[PDB]
Amino acid sequence: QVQLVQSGAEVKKPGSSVKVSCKASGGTFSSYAISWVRQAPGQGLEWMGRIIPIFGTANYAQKFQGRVTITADESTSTAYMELSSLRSEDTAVYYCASLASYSSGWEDVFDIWGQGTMVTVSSASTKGPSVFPLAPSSKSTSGGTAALGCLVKDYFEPVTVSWNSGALTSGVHTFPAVLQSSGLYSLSSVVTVPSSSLGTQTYICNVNHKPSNTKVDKKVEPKS
Amino acid sequence: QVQLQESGGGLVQPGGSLRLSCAASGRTISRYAMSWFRQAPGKEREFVAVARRSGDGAFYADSVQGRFTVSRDDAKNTVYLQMNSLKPEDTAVYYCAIDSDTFYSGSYDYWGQGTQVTVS
Amino acid sequence: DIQMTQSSSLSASVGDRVTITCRASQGISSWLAWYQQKPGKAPKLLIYDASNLETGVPSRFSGSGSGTDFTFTISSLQPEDIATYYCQQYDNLPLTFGGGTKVEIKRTVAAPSVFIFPPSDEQLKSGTASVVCLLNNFPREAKVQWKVDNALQSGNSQESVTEQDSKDSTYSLSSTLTLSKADYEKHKVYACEVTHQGLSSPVTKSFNRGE
Amino acid sequence: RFASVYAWNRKRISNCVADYSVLYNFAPFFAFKCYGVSPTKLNDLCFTNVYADSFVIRGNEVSQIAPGQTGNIADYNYKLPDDFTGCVIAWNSNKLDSKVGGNYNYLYRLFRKSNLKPFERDISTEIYQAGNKPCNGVAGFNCYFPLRSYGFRPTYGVGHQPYRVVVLSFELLHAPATVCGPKKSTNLVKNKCVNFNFNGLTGTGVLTESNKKFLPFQQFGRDIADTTDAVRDPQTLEILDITPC
Ligand SMILES: *[C@@H]1O[C@H](CO)[C@@H](O)[C@H](O)[C@H]1NC(C)=O
């Protein structure tokens, strides 16, 4: 039995060096071989390199040599990965998987995979979000349904936007991660609710940002 | 994006059909096939008929026995029929669409307007 | 160098048969694998030899082909097939993967729920304005444009489309305009008109200075 | 896919027709050596069982695949018996197994606690003990990982290129036989001097209905000096006596 666990997420400046590793749990470090593969947002999987802890043989992709360095040991039983002079384009999630081509007539496929290490590059730092509600007009009601909005901007990166303390989930429209020119991200959630409830029933939108450990709750109100 | 509009009517007697007179605008719809589908309560879209460029009339499914012969006149970007007006069983809502593959017969639809109908 | 091309997006209903191929420039010596993967998650290996399935995957998944060609196949789709699949080459050391074919559970089309709301005073008093247009529960393609002061404008809003809804295979396009308070007060009417693969016309919704 | 020289694959072939012509007429089989049997005669023989062992090794290292040889492979990975009868077939596999600085899945044992016995196979990869120092983890001189990979690079020459090998081991006693070749049977002749080929046993003599009680598990009978005195037909199972004309 074999299973892998990777490190947590990381965030650093461009042009610096980022360090990441994966534990060679299960089986043994001698009967195990590790290989790193990149997956960029909007792209498939892409190879970074391979390392056999017991044989010590390592290699890289024809476009990441020097930029990427790979190392491993047995005292810790993990493959070390270091990416130097990282560009702003290096914002991606890196995977550490088992290299099956190491032993006994298997081939170069990955039977066991880790979770994933998200490495992001931006000029901003970890800080809380800015949140504000919507303000629809009464005549916006249509077909017994009305929209309610809750927006988040200037945040740095998971932001959980929930409605009615998370008790509402029908009709949830959410943004994917979109970054602004100032190096900051944004996320907004909008829901569809009965129109007759707007003004009669109380609804509230909440936001949470775990990295900075902060919460924001705001009340939405129509206006005319 | 492309525009598709709806026209029809002309209830003379309960003969059994749907007076599709779809029309289009803003695209050379002669490059694509024009089709139409039906939607019954709790039923997926079923291929009813298509106005192919073969010129031999319409290709339709067995669900419509003898009541649809859709045809086109691309010089006016409009559909035309020859069957009777309507009947209760054919009052189900309808949708008129074009196939987005160049001269193909496979279904990948962009549809337009529609309205409701009823007859004794 | 060796490369491949999967051939990109599919849609199928439970029960039907689907086939996908990843072409290449030079004959791969049957050294090709295929993975299952939710977009942005750890993949799961299904096929590692062209004609041998791994332990744990049912026989529903299959594959065929040899040499400079291959064809991955699902004998019958099921709701658990909401994910992308990646063709992988391992004939030589410079490992490369495919772009990833994505098959979506197919529930037929539906009209969108279109909406709008102007910005609140909380947004306005900060020197900026924003207007969110909405498309809910509708395939994926769509577009939004604006006609402030009755004239056409474009290239000032952020369009973002949500991943497929597993309940009805629909999508959701949530978009937002963002401009200055000066741009807000300059025009006598702010308007969103929504276009969509299915819609009767550009759905016009607008507001004025006060409201 | 072919297995490594260690933990080699083994497939038992029984109860079928062996058409060795389609095997000999293959072009890439650049090396085809048989012991105790001639390839041209395979189609006329019948055996009690057939075992096919497959693996991949270096190019010139194939010279170690033979009876009573010495070397890393022949001593610690795969050793053929001294009385081996069968065939050793090898062909180049550069178009299949070679990768530039890769192909680690093929490995062989360099050292072992003792010489491997004929047709033995050690699946375990435990680290050899050095003796002069305790070895529970990785260590130096003698406690190195016993396996090491070829790493077949296309730049290597024929002396280190990957060669795919399969050894066909035949058992050639006269017990229930089931892997005969494509030879066709002929109606039996009795009471006449006839040349016979009974399930591989070829000879001359007159065939007569037997009167001795063969036990249900017996197939042949012998007089003094290994002289086949009787045989049972592989078709109707009737016992027949053989007498020289
Ligand atoms: C073999 O076939 C022959 C003729 O078809 C038949 O007479 C004989 O009984 C068969 N023997 C066995 C063992 O099936």
Author numbering:
A (entry chain U): 1 to 156, 158 to 225
B (entry chain W): 10 to 129
C (entry chain V): 1 to 7, 9 to 139, 141 to 213
D (entry chain C): 346 to 590
Q: How does the study describe this entry?
A:
The matured spike protein contains two subunits: an ACE2-binding S1 subunit and a membrane-fusion S2 subunit. Extensive structures of the spike trimer reveal the open and closed conformations for the three RBDs within the spike trimer, where the open “up” RBD conformation is prerequisite for ACE2 binding.
To evaluate the neutralizing activity of JMB2002 against the Omicron BA.2 variant, we first evaluated the binding of JMB2002 to the Omicron BA.2 spike trimer. JMB2002 Fab recognized the Omicron BA.2 spike trimer with KD of approximately 2.6 nM. Meanwhile, JMB2002 IgG bound to the Omicron BA.2 spike trimer with KD of approximately 0.3 nM. As we would expect, JMB2002 effectively blocked the entry of the Omicron BA.2 pseudovirus into human ACE2-expressing cells in a pseudovirus neutralization assay, with the half-maximal inhibition concentration (IC50) of 0.2 μg/mL, which is the same as for the inhibition of Omicron BA.1 pseudovirus. To explore the basis of JMB2002 inhibition of Omicron BA.2, we solved the structure of the Omicron BA.2 spike trimer bound to a Fab from JMB2002 at a global resolution of 3.27 Å, with the aid of the same nanobody to stabilize the constant regions of Fab as we used in the Omicron BA.1 study. The cryo-EM density map reveals the binding of three Fab molecules, with each RBD (two RBDs up and one RBD down) bound to a Fab (labeled as RBD-1-3 and Fab-1-3 in Fig. 3c, d), which was also similar to one of our previously solved structures of JMB2002 Fab bound to the Omicron BA.1 spike trimer. Superposition of the structure of Fab-bound Omicron BA.2 spike trimer with the 3-hACE2-bound BA.2 structure demonstrated that Fab-1 binding to the down RBD-1 would clash with hACE2-1 and hACE2-2, while Fab-3 binding to the up RBD-3 would clash with hACE2-3.
